[PDB]
Amino acid sequence: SFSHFLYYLVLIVVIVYGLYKLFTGHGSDINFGKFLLRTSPYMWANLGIALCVGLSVVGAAWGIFITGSSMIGAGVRAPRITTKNLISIIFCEVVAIYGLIIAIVFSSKLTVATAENMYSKSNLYTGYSLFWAGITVGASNLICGIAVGITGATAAISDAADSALFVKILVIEIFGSILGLLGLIVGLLMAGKASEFQ
Amino acid sequence: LEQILWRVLRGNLFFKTVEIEQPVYDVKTREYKHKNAFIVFSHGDLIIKR
Amino acid sequence: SNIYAPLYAPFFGFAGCAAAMVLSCLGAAIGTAKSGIGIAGIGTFKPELIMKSLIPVVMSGILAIYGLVVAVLIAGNLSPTEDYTLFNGFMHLSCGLCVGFACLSSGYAIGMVGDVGVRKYMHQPRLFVGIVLILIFSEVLGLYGMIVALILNTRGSE
Amino acid sequence: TELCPVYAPFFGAIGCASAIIFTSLGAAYGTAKSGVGICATCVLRPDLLFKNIVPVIMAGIIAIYGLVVSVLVCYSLGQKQALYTGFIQLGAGLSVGLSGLAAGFAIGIVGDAGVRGSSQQPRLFVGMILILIFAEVLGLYGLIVALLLNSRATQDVV
Amino acid sequence: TELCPVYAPFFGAIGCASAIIFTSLGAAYGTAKSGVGICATCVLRPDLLFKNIVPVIMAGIIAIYGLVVSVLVCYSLGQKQALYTGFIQLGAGLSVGLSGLAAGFAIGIVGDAGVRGSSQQPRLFVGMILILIFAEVLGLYGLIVALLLNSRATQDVVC
Amino acid sequence: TELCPVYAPFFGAIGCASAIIFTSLGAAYGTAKSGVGICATCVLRPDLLFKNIVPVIMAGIIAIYGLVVSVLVCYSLGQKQALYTGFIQLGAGLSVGLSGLAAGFAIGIVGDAGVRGSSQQPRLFVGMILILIFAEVLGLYGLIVALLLNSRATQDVVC
Amino acid sequence: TELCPVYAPFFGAIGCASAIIFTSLGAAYGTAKSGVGICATCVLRPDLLFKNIVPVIMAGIIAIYGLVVSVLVCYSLGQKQALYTGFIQLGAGLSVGLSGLAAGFAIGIVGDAGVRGSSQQPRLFVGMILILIFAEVLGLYGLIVALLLNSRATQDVVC
Amino acid sequence: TELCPVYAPFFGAIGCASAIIFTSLGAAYGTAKSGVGICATCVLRPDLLFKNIVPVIMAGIIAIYGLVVSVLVCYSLGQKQALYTGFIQLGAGLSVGLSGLAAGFAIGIVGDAGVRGSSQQPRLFVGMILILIFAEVLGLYGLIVALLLNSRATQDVVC
Amino acid sequence: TELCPVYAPFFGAIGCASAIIFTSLGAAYGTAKSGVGICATCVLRPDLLFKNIVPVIMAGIIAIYGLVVSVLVCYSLGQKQALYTGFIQLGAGLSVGLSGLAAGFAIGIVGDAGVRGSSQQPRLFVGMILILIFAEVLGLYGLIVALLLNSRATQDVVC
């Protein structure tokens, strides 16, 4: 397709450029380390925070529409299921709660660094830490929200089929929610020793 | 009707239709359906009955 | 300062943390959700009484536990005051990639096997041992990934 | 300068654009999907028309959140602003925009499903309202994070 | 200069183009979808023609928003404009243009659906009108954001 | 030559090319879709040909907008032109070209639908004309934006 | 030199290539679609072959437009030509080539439809001719833009 | 040298390669589609076998065009050729190759349709020949452009 | 060092990662496909379950190949290793991982088909095992190449 054509073209351009730089003796000109050193720690920290909250909300809303569409479809014949299938919606919400909490905790670190200490060891560490912990929390939350929404859709269907079948799928939903909790915990541990910008 | 008459006559269709200003009640559907007065020209008896 | 510990090495260490935990959660979620589709398929046809159908879901969660363990061990070694070498950063990135992609593969296999076979070992308990054995063979992939990640973490710190 | 390069306003301007654009896209998806559901429902049940408008309004609040953040980060913009400030405004715009995008998509899907279900089952209207409230607080969370970042934007910037 | 590089008007020209381009894309989508619906429904219901034309008009107002922002950005373009002015013009152009693209998508979808539905349900037309106003103000929000940005384009801006 | 680098005419020439390229793409889509509609319609009603040729004419007008902007940009290309002039010419070309591309897509879709409908309902002809005019005003807005940009391309520019 | 870099003829050669390449692509699409239509309809109506050959002829004229531009650009090429000349030749080639590509696509679609419908309705032939002329003037506008560019390619150009 | 860098023959070699590569690809497409048509029709009409072979022969002529341009570019290649010569050789190879690719696609599609129709209608053979000739002239235009380029590759070229 | 850059361990770490990653993907695919087949076949003939476990064991052995090469590369990895050592480790990891990925896909496909067949034909079990051994030796060859590379990783290597 067109998108795959762009993927192949970009790969070809990258390989040709890297080989040209390598052959001409300028392979080190593609300096990822220097790029990481000279890039603003603020970009990494703010991208981490924004991607954390945004991806957590994306997963929460994702699973909400999955579970909710299935609940409303299954409620045409079984309107009883709605009240206790809202637990799936809550499980998807708790994901965005995780993302929001991490965003608040990380934005607490977004102080202004001094000009001569912008790219210090600690400031670069904080930028990388907030970036990667934000991606960890946000992506784990996106995955957890999608998974919990899928399981809540199956739970709504099973509940509509038989009242007794809901609790087992709810246990599966709890197992799904543990993933977002683990992403929260790891994001907190990754930024645990990250100082505020100084 | 015009499409079908075009296809059965293999082209060679002289079809005229005129709008009827007022809708006419139909007992089959109990609806006040708009109608058109149409005329179609052909020679053979077989094509007339078709 | 020290050439072997440039200040951008924490980027790769934290990328290892993120890869470990995110890919392990992705595998755990694939396994849990696809196996849960299987469990729901059991529903309204053969609703059981004792819950041996949760084995694929539990092992999917164990994949996320593997990723958690590796991510925690990596993040323990990452400090803004400690001399973090570029070798340590690459070792931690390898830890994360290893455990995360192994757990992603384990979750794919666990999800497939659980969805297809939880119905078939709840319908007939004879197939329980075989399907659980296939699920163990799916789980040991993530186990291998975590073992390599543990070795890589030990090597990178020393 | 080092702290205020010339391209620093780019991140603020593009964060303002993102805040309005992604929230408007989410709100437009919500409005379109819910509105198709409403039109489909109200062919045979026109009495539920103004009762079914709720998802469209809860989609509009997403674009309103994006507008709020765009106004804030626009009034924080400046030719000689710090890179700190520009990335703060980029983070605010991106957070609210991505949250509003997700929330509006969920509102569209859930509102479509729920207006159809309430056409078939009037008891589903309350459940649909509840799910839409849950979907709307997600755009609210993105707005809250944007507010935190924007409040911190003016700190000690020289 | 450093604050006013030679490429600074590039972003302004791209923003001025983007305003009209993306609002016209949204307006074109709205016009095409709503017009397919109108031509579908008005074969059997020609009396509803000037009544179903409304989504087409609001799709056109989307492009009017884009044209307004394009003119306002165009008359603030300059050879020695600041890079901040270029970023502001680009942001305003993208704001109005992409918000108008979203609004045109919503207007086209809702106008098609409601023009088709109102052929069978006359009471659905007021609901269509309300939903279409809600879709139109999505592009009007982008117009607001673009106008605010443009108001700040050359404000406190030095060479 | 800081304000007028050697690559400044590149953007002007790309804008001049794009003004006609994208407007011709939009006009081609309009002509092709309206044309399959017209052919299907005039198989049955060959007398309605000159009524149904309107969408094709209107797409052609989109292409004429693009030609006008290409000529105006072309007669402002210069070897030692300013980089701002090239950026403005590129912006004008993109404006008219992509606005007329959107307009021509709307024209193809709506003209096909309206020609096919007016085959059955002659009262739908005026409505199809209305929607087609609303699709033209998109390309006209792009033309207006391009004309304003072009009028500001060489104004108050130095070397 | 600075205004005539050694890579300046690259853009001119790419424009000369692209003119013929893209007009030949459009002509090939037009010829293929129209030829499928012609061979499908002339199975029953062989007497209409030399009438239905018209869209193929018009696609060929699109290719001829491209050939004209390619010849002019090629003869305007030089080793020490200016970068402005190379940019202008690239713009002329792209404009004629992509305008002729769009024109050839329109010609292919419209000619296919019009020969498939003319085998049933003889009166549709003149309508198909009219729509095909409207699709042909797109390539003609691209050719005009390319000719004007090429006329300005070496006009007031220094090294 | 500035005018004749060491990588200048890269463009010439790529043009020589692409001249045969793309013409062979277009000729292969033409041969494959026409051969499918032949082997599908000649099962019931094996007498028309030597008449239906024409599109395969014409795709072969496209490949011969590419071969001619390839040998002409190959013999113009040199270690110390100018960068302009490399550009011209690349343009020649691209022109002939991609025009021949388009011509081969048109030939394959048109030849398939024509062979099937001629199996259905003897009088359609002449029309098929006309459309196939109109597909040949596309690759022939590419050949002409490539030859005109190659006649200038070393014409007034400084070391 | 010139021969031992600080980024030299990157290639070895990526080699170890690749050894785990691709062998795990291959083993997962093999196990999943084979297990789907096993479950689909044991719904009727449960006693064949422990006979059909074989492809899952083959996939597990592929994963063990990957684990072995990763452990070996880990214990060859150092902070001050040569860039050549890193290249060798990357080659070893890539070879074992991607050979085991190919082996795992072959094992999944063959094991699925073979368990399906063996549920019907008891004699096809030995044929399945033979084809599975042939799919296994692909991962084995990747393993062998990785071990040979890893044996040459630090053999006559200057710091």
Added chain:
Amino acid sequence: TELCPVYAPFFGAIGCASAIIFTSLGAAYGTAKSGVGICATCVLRPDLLFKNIVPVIMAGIIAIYGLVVSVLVCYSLGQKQALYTGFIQLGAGLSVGLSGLAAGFAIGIVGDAGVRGSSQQPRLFVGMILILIFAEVLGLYGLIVALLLNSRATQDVV
């Protein structure tokens, strides 16, 4: 060494690889599709088996073209070869390889059609042979270009 750089053999080696790789891909496609046709027609008409093997032989000849050019380029490769020689070797490899890829595509398609049709019409065999010769001559043109190019590779080269 300015015009005989160290990376000059890269293009020669890539061209040597490309010749055989792409002619083998074209030969593989031709052999695979022609052989599928042969196996499809020889179930009911095994008498035509050795007549239907012709397209497979044509594809094999395509691969032989690629092998010939690969051997010639390989033996013209050197550590201190000129960049022009490397470019010419790359061009020759690409010429023969991609021309033979196209020829093998045509051979596969036409040979499949012709073996399926010849079982129904014996006189279609000669037509299939003619079309297959035309397809083969494409790879032959590529080989001719490659041979002329390879002849220019070290001619008057410093």
Added chain:
Amino acid sequence: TELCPVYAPFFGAIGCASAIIFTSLGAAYGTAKSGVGICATCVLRPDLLFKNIVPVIMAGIIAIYGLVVSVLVCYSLGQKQALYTGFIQLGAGLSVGLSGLAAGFAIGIVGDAGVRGSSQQPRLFVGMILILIFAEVLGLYGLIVALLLNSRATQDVVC
């Protein structure tokens, strides 16, 4: 050095890996598809189980070609090897690997078709083997090219 840069072993290691990787991919495709065919056919006719195994053996031989080239490249691989040696090792690996990939594609497709047909036509077995030999010699040619390259890899190579 200059002729022997530090990164020179990267290309050799990539070639050694790619030999086995791509021949394993081709062998895996051949084995998987032929094995699916075998399992399908030998459900009813287990007596043909060991006749039908030959495409699987031939895909395995492709993998053995890849393993041979990988071993030979691995043992000519050094820290201070020439860049030319690395290029030659990469070329040998790529040639054998991708020729074996193509050969394995052909082995899988032809072997699947031939084992499925030979279950119905016992005479078709010889035809299957003949076509499979023609597919196998593709990987053989790749191997021959790789061995010739590898023989030239460290011959007349200095620094």
Added chain:
Amino acid sequence: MEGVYFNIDNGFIEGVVRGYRNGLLSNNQYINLTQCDTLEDLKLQLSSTDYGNFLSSVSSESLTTSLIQEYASSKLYHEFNYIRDQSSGSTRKFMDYITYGYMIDNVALMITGTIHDRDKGEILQRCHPLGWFDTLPTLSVATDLESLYETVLVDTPLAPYFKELDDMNIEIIRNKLYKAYLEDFYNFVTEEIPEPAKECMQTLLGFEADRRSINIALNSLQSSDIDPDLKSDLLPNIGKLYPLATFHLAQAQDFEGVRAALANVYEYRGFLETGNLEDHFYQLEMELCRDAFTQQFAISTVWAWMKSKEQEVRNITWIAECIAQNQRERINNYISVY
């Protein structure tokens, strides 16, 4: 993954169809129906199911098995129409394809009534509500396949499937239409239906093709006008019998040849060696539809529910026949899997 994007457009549809599946009669409900001895008692028990008061408009004396079947089928049709009205995109195309078979049925019914000189209004009233098209009543004008194709069928969605009339000719046309339609629907599933539903629908359509192929092979034996070349034109090319057993059946002239061809497939052996052939196909269809309900994010659920309700109406109509006609020994000869 299946659940990732399915619920964007099909979450509500699939939940409603699964509610419909929950509405399928269970084994206990079928047993309660079987215990009935009068059609009024059958109506009473059937009102305790999701059929509900679908017969409340019918008086006790007016109640007939034809009425019971007609009202149960009408409930099916209204449910399908509601589900299709909520469909868009590829799901709308999927359900349109579901309707194309009923379109073929309606075409064959119209032509059969026309050649039999039945009342046009009676045939139109008897046309399947699903598979209705606007030009369906125009099929009464001619008894020529070419005339009806040019007149009507060229504008219908059945137009791609056609690439004076008597009973055998109408049969041949209907089976050719089914072969083309099954192939087209299989292709549509392969290219446009996501993976779990893709595999389920491929299996279900292949089973339907195999059922038709085996029926044609076994019923061509008792006919002389069905040429071996014509049998190839009637056997679909998508099933498990294709292409091996399909080719074998296209050449068979005896029952033993057909049975040997069906011994090729491990899925259909025993169909001819015991019981009734149609009972095996009905049981297999209900088993496959029951398995399709184990997939949660598959649109194949719509087809599975449709076939399960058609079988359910068959079962209820059979029970009504074994209540009206007495014949309570055969009352349990219905296929039930839910």
